[PDB]
Design a binder for these strands. Structure first.
Ligand SMILES: Nc1nc2c(ncn2[C@@H]2O[C@H](COP(=O)(O)OP(=O)(O)NP(=O)(O)O)[C@@H](O)[C@H]2O)c(=O)[nH]1
Ligand SMILES: [K+]
Ligand SMILES: [Mg+2]
Ligand SMILES: [Mg+2]
Ligand SMILES: [Mg+2]
Ligand SMILES: [Mg+2]
Ligand SMILES: [Mg+2]
Ligand SMILES: [Mg+2]
Ligand SMILES: [Mg+2]
Ligand SMILES: [Mg+2]
Ligand SMILES: [Mg+2]
Ligand SMILES: [Mg+2]
Ligand SMILES: [Mg+2]
Ligand SMILES: [Mg+2]
Ligand SMILES: [Mg+2]
Ligand SMILES: [Mg+2]
Ligand SMILES: [Mg+2]
Ligand SMILES: [Mg+2]
Ligand SMILES: [Mg+2]
Ligand SMILES: [Mg+2]
Ligand SMILES: [Mg+2]
Ligand SMILES: [Mg+2]
Ligand SMILES: [Mg+2]
Ligand SMILES: [Mg+2]
Ligand SMILES: [Mg+2]
Ligand SMILES: [Mg+2]
Ligand SMILES: [Mg+2]
Ligand SMILES: [Mg+2]
Ligand SMILES: [Mg+2]
Ligand SMILES: [Mg+2]
Ligand SMILES: [Mg+2]
Ligand SMILES: [Mg+2]
Ligand SMILES: [Mg+2]
Ligand SMILES: [Mg+2]
Ligand SMILES: [Mg+2]
Ligand SMILES: [Mg+2]
Ligand SMILES: [Mg+2]
Ligand SMILES: [Mg+2]
Ligand SMILES: [Mg+2]
Ligand SMILES: [Mg+2]
Ligand SMILES: [Mg+2]
Ligand SMILES: [Mg+2]
Ligand SMILES: [Mg+2]
Ligand SMILES: [Mg+2]
Ligand SMILES: [Mg+2]
Ligand SMILES: [Mg+2]
Ligand SMILES: [Mg+2]
Ligand SMILES: [Mg+2]
Ligand SMILES: [Mg+2]
Ligand SMILES: [Mg+2]
Ligand SMILES: [Mg+2]
Ligand SMILES: [Mg+2]
Ligand SMILES: [Mg+2]
Ligand SMILES: [Mg+2]
Ligand SMILES: [Mg+2]
Lengths: 133, 73, 414
RNA sequence: GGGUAGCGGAGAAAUUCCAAUCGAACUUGGAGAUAGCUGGUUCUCUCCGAAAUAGCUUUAGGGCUAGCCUCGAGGUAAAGAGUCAUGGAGGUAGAGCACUGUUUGGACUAGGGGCCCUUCUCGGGUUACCGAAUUCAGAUAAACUCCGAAUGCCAUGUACUUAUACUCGGGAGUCAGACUGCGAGUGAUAAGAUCCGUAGUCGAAAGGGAAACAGCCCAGACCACCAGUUAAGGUCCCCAAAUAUAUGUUAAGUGGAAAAGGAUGUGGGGUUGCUUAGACAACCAGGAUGUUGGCUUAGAAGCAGCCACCAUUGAAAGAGUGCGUAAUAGCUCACUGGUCGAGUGACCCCGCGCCGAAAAUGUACCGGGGCUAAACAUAUUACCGAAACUGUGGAUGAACC
RNA sequence: AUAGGCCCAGGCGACUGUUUAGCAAAAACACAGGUCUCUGCAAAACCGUAAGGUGACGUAUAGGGGCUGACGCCUGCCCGGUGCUGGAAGGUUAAGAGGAGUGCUUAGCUUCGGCGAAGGUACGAAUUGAAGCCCCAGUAAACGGCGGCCGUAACUAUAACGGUCCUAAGGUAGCGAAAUUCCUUGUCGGGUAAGUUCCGACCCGCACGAAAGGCGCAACGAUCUGGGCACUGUCUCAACGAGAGACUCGGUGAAAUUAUAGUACCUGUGAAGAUGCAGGUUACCCGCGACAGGACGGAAAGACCCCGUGGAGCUUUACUGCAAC
RNA sequence: CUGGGGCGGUCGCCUCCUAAAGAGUAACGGAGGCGCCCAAAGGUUCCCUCAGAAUGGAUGGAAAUCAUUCGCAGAGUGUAAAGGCACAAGGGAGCUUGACUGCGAGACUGACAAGUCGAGCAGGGACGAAAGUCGGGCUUAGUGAUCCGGUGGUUCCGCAUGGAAGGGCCAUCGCUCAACGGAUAAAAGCUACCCCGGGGAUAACAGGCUUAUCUCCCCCAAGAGUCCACAUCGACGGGGAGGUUUGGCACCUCGAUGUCGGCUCGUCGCAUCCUGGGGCUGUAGUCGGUCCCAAGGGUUGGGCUGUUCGCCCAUUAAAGCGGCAC
RNA sequence: CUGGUAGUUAUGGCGAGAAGGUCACACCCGUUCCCAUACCGAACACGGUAGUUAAGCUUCUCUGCGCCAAUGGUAGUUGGGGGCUUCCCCCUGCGAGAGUAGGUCGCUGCCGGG
């Protein structure tokens, strides 16, 4: 998951204060994985969690990724002093605020959904809760 | 490759609503008409709004989305 | 959108230089790069300053702008200076065959043991190319030749403590993960079960031959290896129990593929993977017969196996993908030579017979008389030997079979 | 014994030698060279008391003007400060998707590309391979806004408090700042990092607390007192004051470092299934029959594997829950009557705990002792506790009578 | 008692000499030899303002300067650029010469307005006016520089031979992991039980490279490098003995250093490494012989590093100058 | 200038974001522009409305022009961006030169130098029937002082007097002075032969903070392991501890904390190399593997490399890893 | 009653449906004159009033689109305190945006004709 293009190549880290303004109620699937505390979810973590959910379902039922990594983040290499302008873009993150349903799934029984989502949750740097519609 | 920026142009309101001003007092500095000339007010060549006569400054609405500054003696 | 690259080759009196270029183009497709240009220069010995003659270095720069290639790929491993001289002369990025293979593995590689092997290679490959830059770095802008107490050198251990120390850490880590293989070997070794190891060139079809023999001749036929029409599909050895319809048992092992001009650093890592092949009872060399350059592929393979340390091991030269031809018949044998199609069952049933001729020779016929009270021994003969006939008397059961010498000690009383 | 002398000699050449001095000798003079640099600069009390910023600078550790201090003077609807009221400018927080960008999933047709193709791929029939619109639902933003606060800011008042303000002169110092909180950037949402904003303290602030501890908490030292009351923080002993009161929690020395994750810890709630016409635990029978159900296989007889998974005797027993056999035999469960005589079994939420938890001289992650409260929670009240404030006496500046 | 250790194999320098008085004795300097160049004699060159000198009481087989460095074999291609030397007489240029004219001034003349001689004065055009430069030739033991592309070379020549493009010309002979080698502890051998050093073949410098010489080379060296024999307290691993000092006594008697000191340890704390602060833990008072962990011990206002509109020496196609020619 | 200095980059002006809803506000923070242009692209009068899509039409094609309907701007606005603009500031046409001279109450902005806006008055105009508007351009960049020269003008001065020379005043022109408040008309390097003044304001060593990186330990479990996730391993991802690495920072020390390796002497941690005890094992046995407990003692002679390290020879029960100013 | 002309954030607008007409208003007929078209009497201008409410115009109904919009709650937040500090919580005051109940097919002034 990467933005096809971006207005600006570099961008503020921002902050993660408050409950997510939207996407706090499961809207597509039966079951959803709700963030309980805030964190940056990198695209590498979203892919890890997606494959983990999907493999366990065996091409059965649907998986909605409700978060997208819109925000680039930069880094400085090792052995580079501070200054000389902002570092090069490294990757892509989605700042997930608390209460944000990150994944949703439908078309499998509760037990498989609940199992799929715990496998997904173990790849994410955030405390999760499984919630249903 | 960045590092540049112009001097700030100290735009915005220079006298308050309800304040006695002398003729020629700049009321508002602006690019374009954020605010429009009212009664006894003129728009300078760079959109500066100024009092044409002495009087009290009044910022009014002039129709839903627009705004104007008048000077009533 | 696959980026644009340009490939450069030099015939140092190479036997089939034409293939080496086709292959490097195939490799470039595998790394996901679009080969726009093919620059061939026919000199005897390579220019130790710019790999190609300084004349061609312009002829490339010219074609690289006309085709718009972001980087240029060189068919031989380039010296450090050899690279820097091109970087400046071309004003473009440069990647030799070694760095191009190291990229392909790095992608394809999805086990720790593999990932480390390839990290060790890339570091061993890159270490030099940083050395000359790391020494030149701050020779102009230095501490006035260090007339101070600071002590030490910025000449050595700028690289050797940045890289080379971590190469020592990564080898120490890889040694620990290959010593754990001796513990997984332990049971097979102790049980003295004969090992039939597949080798060959990439795409040869060996991971497919394996899949074939696991469908047909495995108790658990749910488990097939990854097969696909890409270069270096497999990178980690598999081991699968093959139980023939007669009840003879061997292990079938599928390894990494080989490819011409394989980096002398990757070769050190390979030795760990081919550990089962060197210790194999039989060696099955699979060649792609359908391809034109198969005598070229086969010799390049053998030359590699010698470097890996595969010596004095019974070999069988299986020629594969027969179906792609119309002239040749499917199953044929001519000593070590065997023509077959990995897709087809008849081919495998035939390959199976060839294995059963080389491994289970010591299996000879013998007669046994087992009283009814010790039935368990009838089960052993039904499970661990090929029964020809099963005779029944009043005193007990009389069964004549092909058994191993190991069984002719155990059932000796019968 | 002689010669070559410093803008110079001499040199089989090293910057080598020219009186213990040599990339240019020694001595006197110019000369108290110059030094935006370092060091140093000597009596006392009283009143006030900064700055470490802006701009410009061959400027960046210098300077100049301004800002901030001080002294004097002047005029002065008091023009300064706070709050209330009233008015107003302004797009941040939040939010939102109306625009612009980023984006998920449907539905919808265009088309092109796959796919078959009477075809010249002109036209059909399919597509889920792409596709640009289109709507429906749903997201997202420092450089998006249909919206939009709190504050802050500018004014006005005939409001209530308060006491500064401004102008002109004389004299400055300052132009390395630090940390803490809050809002940002840079960084890795690292730094006792760096750079702004904003408040505070330090700087230039002693006192009490935080073991010790510029920058944290409390609070400002005119002098004296063997007086009093309080702040933060405390009250078992070191050590002044509660071994205080009430109701709970914790067993970990948790308290008195540490996460993902893991778990039959313990307290409280809240749903809920079975239950003296007998549950749940154990103990006493039974646990059969078609029948080795069929296929498969050498053998598969409940129990390698595949496919079915019906009925039967009644108290009910699966075409079988685990072991076992080579296959059989054998032991066991489910599932029922009997005995026994009260509870027993799921799930969710909260409190406090547990594991996860390894570093180098010596206990060493409460200052110590030591604590099962001397810990924690909620509520209460006494006391201790500062150079705070008060009392008494004294000294002293200013203003006004 | 006093009197060479020796041998094998490399690098460098021919050699004996010379050198950084006081950290370098060498591979550096010198050297004989080589070559280039200047110099016709009041020589050139050098010192000096000059006179006067050295050169030389010499005279091209001589003298000055540059480079190279015995000897042996050799020293390739390039004169396009830069220098030097010569040529040519066009272009440009200075002072000087020249003085057409033009301002200013005024005796007059004025039709008002303006004209305006003579003289004076301030400028001044053409024309004239050298070297240098611009241009042409030579010169590399002057400063310097010494390529690609495409085929055939079946081999074998890392660098041939044949086509082309460009160049002033394309690095010749010889040599090559080197006092020179990035990949590189290059590859194979030797030597060792084990050899990143050493030695010798392959590969190798993008060609190291021919008088800032290339390649050899007997003799020579307090030169550097590798190996062997001798021999041994160098070491396994230390022991004993002698003298001088140390120590005690008698005599004599300094020094650097030093805020005052009744000057423990641990863990912490703090300008982030504490004898001195906190909490603990230890500890009777005073010495002598010993040892150096600490007192961020002593010594020297850090040589490194930065800064200062601080110096100084050196360079040059930095600026501006000056001698000399 | 500079998260030491050098190298690279930058230096003045304009727009935005950073900027915390007045103004202002830093960084070698994030993005872009400028060093002009226009005789109309200026003034004024009058008149007008754009983009795009649907639909139909010859050359005509997805897209030229024409017609219709729907179209608040999805266009345009010389030129970046922001703020504006459909009564248009956008588009036509007619006449024009106000892209005027003298000024200017009063404001804004500013340390100063400068910069910005300005009603209104007079002279004389342009357009307009008049009202009126017009001292350039929708607004905000497009520039550079003084000194010294040049040209033009002049009821100014003219060194006894008349002139003149020369100066003054008004107008205007000539340097990338761009390091853009401009040291001069005129300015590059080396110092390891160095020197002085200073600085822990500032680097190299060690300490400190930090812990990205590093080492070690974990979670999840797709895989590997002959069947078989968890004997032994473990991808994609996730969470910690440590403070030995590579780094970041510049807090102590520049009136000196004076050095890598080796030698001598050790001491400490345990994340244990050996020896001791145990659990699991792909533990038949032997030989092993792995984890738990365990720091009492022990833990080597050589060759090569200056080498820590490494490689090798030969041993050993073992030839542990770290800390202590490496 | 209708023509003109103002004011008022669209509660005023748009869209849909209906009715009305010498009392104006309008379209409508003409191009001789003033005056027009970068071509066109379309427009602009001028002269007519045969013809018609079809359209604009005026009045009436409608909540489909827009527009306006409480209360309550929430977000945020000044000040004051706490934590386990990517942040979170408590007290006091202020208090959105969205969403919702609901409101709206305007209101108001002058002048002429009726
Ligand atoms: N027609 C045909 N195709 C074959 C045959 N054998 C293999 N292939 C195809 O060739 C592909 C490449 O062979 P595969 O076994 O996957 O590769 P491999 O031999 O394992 N090589 P590697 O593992 O190194 O990538 C197979 O995936 C299969 O599609 C054959 O006999 N005939
Ligand atoms: K998680
Ligand atoms: Mg700014
Ligand atoms: Mg203007
Ligand atoms: Mg394969
Ligand atoms: Mg020297
Ligand atoms: Mg001397
Ligand atoms: Mg003097
Ligand atoms: Mg002096
Ligand atoms: Mg005071
Ligand atoms: Mg926001
Ligand atoms: Mg915003
Ligand atoms: Mg700081
Ligand atoms: Mg602050
Ligand atoms: Mg101070
Ligand atoms: Mg204090
Ligand atoms: Mg204290
Ligand atoms: Mg102090
Ligand atoms: Mg009290
Ligand atoms: Mg007490
Ligand atoms: Mg007091
Ligand atoms: Mg010599
Ligand atoms: Mg010496
Ligand atoms: Mg010596
Ligand atoms: Mg003479
Ligand atoms: Mg020489
Ligand atoms: Mg000579
Ligand atoms: Mg000449
Ligand atoms: Mg060797
Ligand atoms: Mg050596
Ligand atoms: Mg020559
Ligand atoms: Mg030469
Ligand atoms: Mg020589
Ligand atoms: Mg000698
Ligand atoms: Mg004595
Ligand atoms: Mg103490
Ligand atoms: Mg001593
Ligand atoms: Mg010292
Ligand atoms: Mg000093
Ligand atoms: Mg720097
Ligand atoms: Mg720094
Ligand atoms: Mg602002
Ligand atoms: Mg005169
Ligand atoms: Mg400047
Ligand atoms: Mg030297
Ligand atoms: Mg000094
Ligand atoms: Mg410092
Ligand atoms: Mg500084
Ligand atoms: Mg350091
Ligand atoms: Mg220190
Ligand atoms: Mg700092
Ligand atoms: Mg000192
Ligand atoms: Mg342990
Ligand atoms: Mg050694
Ligand atoms: Mg040390």
């Amino acid at each position: 998951l990467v933005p096809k293009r971006v207005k600006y190549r570099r961008e503020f880290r921002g902050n993660m204060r408050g409950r997510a303004k939207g996407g706090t109620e499961v809207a597509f699937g039966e079951y959803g994985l709700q963030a309980v505390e805030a964190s940056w979810i990198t695209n590498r973590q979203i892919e890890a969690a997606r494959i983990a959910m999907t493999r366990y379902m065996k091409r059965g039922g649907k998986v909605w990724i409700k978060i997208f990594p819109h925000k680039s983040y930069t880094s400085k290499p090792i052995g580079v002093r501070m200054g000389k302008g902002k570092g090069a873009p490294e990757g892509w993150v989605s700042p997930v605020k608390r209460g944000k349903i990150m994944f949703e799934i439908a078309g499998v029984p509760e037990d498989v959904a609940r199992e799929a989502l715990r496998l997904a949750a173990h790849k994410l740097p955030v405390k999760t809760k499984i919630v249903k519609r | 490759s960045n590092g540049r920026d112009s001097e700030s142009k100290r735009l915005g309101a220079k006298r308050a609503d309800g304040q006695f001003v002398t003729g020629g007092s700049i009321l508002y500095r602006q690019r374009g008409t954020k605010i429009y000339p009212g009664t006894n007010v003129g728009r300078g060549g760079d959109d500066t709004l100024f009092a044409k006569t002495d009087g009290v400054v009044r910022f009014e609405r002039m129709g839903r989305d627009k705004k104007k500054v008048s000077v009533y003696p | 959108m696959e980026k644009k690259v340009l490939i450069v080759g030099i015939s140092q009196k190479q036997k089939d230089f034409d293939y080496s270029m086709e292959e490097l183009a195939n490799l470039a497709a595998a790394n996901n790069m679009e080969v726009v240009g093919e620059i061939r220069q026919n000199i005897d010995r390579e220019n130790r300053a710019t790999y190609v003659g300084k004349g061609k270095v312009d002829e490339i720069k010219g074609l690289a702008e006309m085709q718009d290639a972001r980087l240029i790929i060189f068919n031989d491993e380039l010296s450090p200076s050899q690279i820097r001289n091109l970087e400046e002369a071309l004003e473009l990025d440069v990647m030799d065959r070694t760095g191009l293979i190291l990229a392909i593995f790095a992608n394809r590689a999805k086990t720790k043991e593999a990932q480390l092997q390839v990290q060790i290679a890339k570091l061993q490959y890159e270490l030099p190319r940083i050395f000359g830059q790391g020494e030149d770095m701050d020779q102009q802008s230095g501490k006035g030749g260090l007339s101070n107490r600071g002590s030490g050198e910025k000449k050595i251990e700028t690289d050797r403590r940045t890289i080379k120390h971590q190469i020592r850490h990564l080898q120490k880590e890889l040694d620990m993960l290959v010593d754990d293989r001796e513990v997984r070997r332990r049971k097979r070794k102790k049980n003295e079960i004969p090992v039939v190891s597949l080798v060959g060139y990439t795409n040869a079809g060996k991971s497919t031959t394996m899949n074939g023999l696991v469908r047909a001749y495995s108790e658990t036929a749910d488990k097939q290896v990854f097969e696909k029409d890409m270069l270096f599909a497999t990178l980690e050895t598999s081991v699968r129990e093959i139980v023939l319809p007669d009840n003879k048992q061997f292990l079938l092992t599928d390894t990494v593929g080989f490819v011409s001009k394989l980096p002398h650093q990757l070769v050190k890592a390979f030795r760990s993977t081919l550990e089962e092949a060197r210790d194999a009872d039989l060696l099955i060399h699979v060649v792609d017969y359908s391809d034109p350059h198969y005598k070229t592929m086969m010799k390049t393979t053998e030359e590699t196996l010698k470097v890996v340390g595969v010596e004095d091991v019974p070999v069988i030269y299986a020629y594969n993908k027969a179906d792609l031809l119309e002239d040749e018949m499917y199953p044929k044998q001519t000593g070590n030579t065997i023509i077959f199609s990995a897709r087809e069952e008849e081919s495998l049933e035939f390959l199976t017979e060839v294995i059963r001729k080389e491994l289970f020779a010591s299996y000879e016929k013998a007669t046994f008389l087992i009283p009814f009270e010790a039935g368990q021994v009838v089960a052993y003969l039904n499970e661990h030997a090929d029964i020809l006939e099963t005779e029944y008397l009043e005193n007990g059961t009389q069964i004549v079979a092909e058994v191993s010498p190991a069984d002719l000690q155990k059932l000796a009383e019968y």
